């Protein structure tokens, strides 16, 4: 069966937030650095075919804006899932070192939007868009985490191993359990945007149970403070309470805020650099 424990070397763990067991690792064969996620299968216990569904769907993507899938190996009864590893860090990570320009933000959103467009075209969706899942290569490339990736007619919230454990980036029609599609990702994008500009999402300081009941009732969040009008305008575009009034990704791709402000993706390595310089050890 060729056992992954000798095919790959596990390094520091990075699965602190969800289920657990995501590691940095190395392909012993090729010295390529990978992400390794190990799933029990025994102690699952959301069914096997659900997990294979996650993989089927993930392996269908071959976009330089969505994190690649390299394959899987079964050791006795644990499954090693190997994916592309991005050594720049997450946008969330990169904020620890200081704030971002509008040019930097817009550069990122542009790339996420391309990822998003690619997904939407295959009637796939994302479902966990947040600065934590905005991932960067060491040369400044930007791509969505594989974590959120899903099929257009799949309920990712019912199942363990896929569910989002915080309501902050969630669209109101999702919270209301009603019919929802890719327009909900667009909403999450709007939140991400506020998050990239402000360091945290609207109402972070609030109890998740109050939040869920405000997100439908209240007016949508807005961008506030020293940001350009077109930036604020981009965020209203995304955060419409009515899914129908939200632009597709293709349309956002040519919003003024993106067109005026985005730049060469390489320029983002200044962020990667700033971060390296910033952190300890």
């Amino acid at each position: 069966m060729a056992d992954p424990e000798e095919l790959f070397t596990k390094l520091e763990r990075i699965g602190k937030g969800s289920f657990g067991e995501v590691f940095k690792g190395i392909d012993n064969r090729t010295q390529q650095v990978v992400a390794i996620k190990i799933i029990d299968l025994e102690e699952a216990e959301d069914e096997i075919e659900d997990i294979q569904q996650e993989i089927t769907v993930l392996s269908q993507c071959d976009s330089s804006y969505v994190t690649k899938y390299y394959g899987s190996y079964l050791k006795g009864s644990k499954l090693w899932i190997i994916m592309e590893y991005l050594g720049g860090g997450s946008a969330l990570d990169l904020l620890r070192a200081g704030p971002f320009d509008e040019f930097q933000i817009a550069t990122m959103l542009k790339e996420i939007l391309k990822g998003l467009d690619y997904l939407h075209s295959e009637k796939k969706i994302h479902r966990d868009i947040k600065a934590a899942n905005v991932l960067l290569s060491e040369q400044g490339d930007v791509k969505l985490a594989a974590f959120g990736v899903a099929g257009q007619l799949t309920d990712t919230q019912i199942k363990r191993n896929t569910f989002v454990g915080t309501p902050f980036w969630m669209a109101p029609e999702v919270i209301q359990q009603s019919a929802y599609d890719s327009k909900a990702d667009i909403w999450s994008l709007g939140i991400t945007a506020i998050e990239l500009a402000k360091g945290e999402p609207p109402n972070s300081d609030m109890h998740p149970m109050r939040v869920l009941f405000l997100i439908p009732k209240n007016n949508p969040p807005t961008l506030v403070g020293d940001f350009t009008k077109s930036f604020k305008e981009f965020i209203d575009a995304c955060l419409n309470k009515d899914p129908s009034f939200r632009p597709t990704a293709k349309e956002l791709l040519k919003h003024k805020f993106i067109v005026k402000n985005s730049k060469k993706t390489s320029y983002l390595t200044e962020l990667i650099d700033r971060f390296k310089r910033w952190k300890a050890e």
Binding site: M1, A2, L41, E42, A44, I48, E49, Q52, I55, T56, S59, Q60, D62, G71, S72, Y73, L74, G76, S77, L79, E122
Partner: protein, 324 residues
């Protein structure tokens, strides 16, 4: 601006791709022409800011039966653009479910082209295409007359190797088709299992023995599902009779894995619940009488939770205690 030329351009540009050297002459242009065709073709079928234009769809269909464009396409597929492969799948899968009257024309004009199907299943040996081919195959075994073909095939029993295959992803996808064959068309499937009982279960018995935790679990589980079907009543009675089959489950109940035992249980209980146990069953049950009550008493009593499971448990014990 043409919905009847793209075919006259692939039976061209796709024909080009075999044979040819890795030479520049067809390396870029010839293969990329193919991918651009498959995109404009899928467009005539799916609504960028256009509609599915029906008149063009009728023309589109009666162009592909010219002549065996799909045969050599599916054959020489392993040399296509990655997104092109995914495109082919999308193309194949929707013309398949075309309809005139209450009649599916694609399905019929494949019942001649009987090899298209076996090519697709032979795809399971080439890892660079296997998955696409799965997606396509499952979409056709989805129509009754098509499942009939692979089921009564000699090529059917290749699944037992395709399921045990090296890479777990493909082993999985294989098993998916294997499953969807035996479950989907209920009346048809029950026909197959009656006639080929002996052969089918010899191989299947191997799966239950081979581990590979996932192969073992999934097929043990599929056994349960095929056994309690009702459509399969004849088959299950034959099954729960052989004392080889009861010794097997008994060992599965003894498995290292919680989840495997629990699965084994749901099959095992049908053996004991049988109102018409044949002698060799009763012999092996009576022989192991003490050790069974011993076992079922302490078998996974953390589940409560499960009214039905404990109910099935006190029931099973009563029955074993009560003999001869």
């Amino acid at each position: 601006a043409s919905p009847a030329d793209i075919v006259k351009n692939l039976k061209e540009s796709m024909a080009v791709l075999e044979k040819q050297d890795i030479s520049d002459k067809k390396a870029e242009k010839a293969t990329e022409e193919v991918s651009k065709n498959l995109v404009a073709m899928k467009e005539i079928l799916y609504g960028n800011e256009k509609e599915p234009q029906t008149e063009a769809v009728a023309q589109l269909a009666q162009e592909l039966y010219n002549s065996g464009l799909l045969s050599t396409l599916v054959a020489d597929l392993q040399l296509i653009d990655f997104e092109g492969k995914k495109d082919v799948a999308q193309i194949f899968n929707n013309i398949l479910r075309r309809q005139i009257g209450t009649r599916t024309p694609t399905v019929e004009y494949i019942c001649t082209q009987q090899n298209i199907l076996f090519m697709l299943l032979k795809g399971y040996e080439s890892p660079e295409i296997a998955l696409n081919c799965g997606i396509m195959l499952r979409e056709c075994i989805r129509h009754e007359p098509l499942a009939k073909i692979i089921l009564w095939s000699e090529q059917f029993y290749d699944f037992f190797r395709y399921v045990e295959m090296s890479t777990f992803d493909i082993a999985s996808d294989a098993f998916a088709t294997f499953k969807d064959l035996l479950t989907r068309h209920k009346l048809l499937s029950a026909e197959f299992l009656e006639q080929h009982y002996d052969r089918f279960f010899s191989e299947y018995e191997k799966l239950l023995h081979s581990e590979n935790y996932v192969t073992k679990r999934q097929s043990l589980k599929l056994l349960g599902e095929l056994l309690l079907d009702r459509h399969n009543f004849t088959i299950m009675t034959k099954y729960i009779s052989k004392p080889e089959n009861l010794k097997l489950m008994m060992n599965l109940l003894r498995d290292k894995s919680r989840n495997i035992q629990f699965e084994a249980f749901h099959v095992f209980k049908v053996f004991v619940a049988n109102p018409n146990k044949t002698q060799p069953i009763l012999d092996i049950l009576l022989k192991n009488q003490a050790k069974l009550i011993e076992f079922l008493s302490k078998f996974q009593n953390d589940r409560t939770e499960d009214e039905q499971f404990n109910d099935e448990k006190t029931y099973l014990v009563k029955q074993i205690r009560d003999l001869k």
